[PDB]
Design a protein around this motif. Sequence first.
Motif, short mmCIF file in Angstrom:
data_model
loop_
_atom_site.label_atom_id
_atom_site.label_comp_id
_atom_site.label_asym_id
_atom_site.label_seq_id
_atom_site.Cartn_x
_atom_site.Cartn_y
_atom_site.Cartn_z
N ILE A 164 -2.36 -1.08 -0.32
CA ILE A 164 -1.86 -1.74 0.88
C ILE A 164 -1.67 -3.25 0.78
O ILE A 164 -0.54 -3.73 0.86
N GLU A 165 -2.75 -3.99 0.59
CA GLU A 165 -2.66 -5.45 0.51
C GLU A 165 -3.76 -6.04 -0.37
O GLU A 165 -4.91 -5.63 -0.27
N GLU A 166 -3.41 -7.00 -1.22
CA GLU A 166 -4.39 -7.61 -2.12
C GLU A 166 -5.18 -8.77 -1.53
O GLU A 166 -6.21 -9.15 -2.07
N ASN A 167 -4.70 -9.32 -0.42
CA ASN A 167 -5.39 -10.42 0.24
C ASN A 167 -5.39 -10.13 1.73
O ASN A 167 -4.40 -10.35 2.42
N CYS A 168 -6.51 -9.62 2.22
CA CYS A 168 -6.62 -9.27 3.63
C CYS A 168 -8.07 -8.99 3.98
O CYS A 168 -8.97 -9.18 3.16
N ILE A 169 -8.29 -8.54 5.21
CA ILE A 169 -9.62 -8.16 5.66
C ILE A 169 -9.52 -6.76 6.24
O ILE A 169 -8.70 -6.52 7.13
#
Lengths: 300, 330
Positions: free
Chosen positions: B125-130
């Motif tokens: 999904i995403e490499e930089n997120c929470i």
Amino acid sequence: MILGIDIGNTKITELHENGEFKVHHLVSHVALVTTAETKKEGVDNILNAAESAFGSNISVFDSNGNFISLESAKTNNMKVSASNWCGTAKWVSKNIEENCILVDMGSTTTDIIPIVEGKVVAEKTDLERLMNHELLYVGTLRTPISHLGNTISFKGVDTNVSSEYFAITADISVVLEKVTTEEYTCDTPDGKGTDKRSSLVRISKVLCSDLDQISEIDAENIAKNYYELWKELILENVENVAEKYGSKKVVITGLGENILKDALADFEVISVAERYGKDVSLATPSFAVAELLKNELLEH
Amino acid sequence: MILGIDIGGANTKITELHENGEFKVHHLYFPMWKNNDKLAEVLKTYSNDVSHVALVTTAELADSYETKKEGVDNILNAAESAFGSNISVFDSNGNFISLESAKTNNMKVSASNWCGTAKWVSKNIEENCILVDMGSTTTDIIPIVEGKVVAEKTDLERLMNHELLYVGTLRTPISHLGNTISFKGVDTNVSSEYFAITADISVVLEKVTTEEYTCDTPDGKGTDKRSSLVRISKVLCSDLDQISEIDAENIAKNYYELWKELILENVENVAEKYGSKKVVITGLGENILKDALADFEVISVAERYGKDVSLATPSFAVAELLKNELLEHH
């Protein structure tokens, strides 16, 4: 020889005859107050049971500060159920101070009731008192710790806490020596012991930890920090009531007197345990209704 | 077909992920503290059609009076009786290991409920997120940086760094949200008694459906809005004879505000530290999370993969992670 009966456990105060009094945990006149599936069955049981060994000479202290004779309580049982502060408040207003705030803390709730010009001026229902700083749902023993706050300072950092039932005020009270181990009479949350270490184990679960990950000193510090949150809750409510009624004198009583004293140092404190003994302080409603019945029957 | 199996303490979730991308999630009641016959039986219906299986055990069950070895052994044996050596077990470190490796190193098999989900997010999904996953009881706030999950190790450490918050969609006692609430314009103290929970607020404000109020009700009564308002009224030691339905709903709305603020503050702290504006939400509490984190760039698992996946992300996540390793050379 008149008796003060508070059925909640039950407490009996033997009054009269120059003032010879004594209380016990379980006669010409008997003052009956009940601070304890329709709630009209148990009411009859209590009333009928009272008649057994006390006869018709029984005065029931209803929801209000009014004493209703027997049969009157049998007719409309919706007055038998009484609070644990009304009787005490009445007694205080006529025997200790006419302008003060009575603060009583049992195992579960803390009552903060203003007394002005000798009359109890606290709101009627529990809801109304919760809305006027006259009822605080924190007690010496049964309060789930996160009710005191969902975050606590731990090792210097604001830490979130678990919402699960793991520790109660009884654990804090024992760890900080505000009550004895023997006074931890409610069930422990985990079914284990009431000793200090066992209490520290329960408190450590609040932070999803145990005494292997954190030390006993760390765990004790959790208890100490929660104790200060507890003191503030008591203080803020009493201050609000005091600000509205201008009262500066506070009369304290109950199992939680030690905690009350710590929280209300800013006020002129009058201790029931100090003026009448720890026994009366732990059985105030029963002793109160005894003194009240005396003065009312002496009105003749 | 790829199978993603998440064995919890009492409930097992199975995701069937098809080659064409279609999937189905199954739910099975299986108490881990008892015999594994039922689990073995269910897994065997896949024995002659499935050879790619991802297995993860998220069972926490605090004190279950059972050793980690017996719990793990029983699960692995049930799976082995159905797939033999054709099983990839997702360990606590977030890596797939062999069945035999799991047996031998049983102490490193059980994973957190968020481990698989967070790694899946970091990869697919995403490499930089929470990641913000709010289930029935807890809210996990997990930072993902440069494709690596970098959350604190223990729950205590997460509690100290806004990565674990004890507010859930259903089981949170309402006073845990705050011991005072505004009522009729004044600060009002509330009961500490177990009378109402977040499930009551969720049903009353329509953040979850009545059918989704799966935990027991505090008073053993209905899960409908009326019964929920009755329980909520008890928090102020009252009832619908003393206060109105509007009054009770106002109590719920005010607590909803406190609840959203608790979620927001914690997520904001983790976000400010890592400088991430993207949040991936999932779990039964997505509707609450969407409201609380409205100012962030929100990615919804429910929207992208459907409600079932949002309510059983761990099983889906390990199935996807297994797919990744498989496609590595296809």
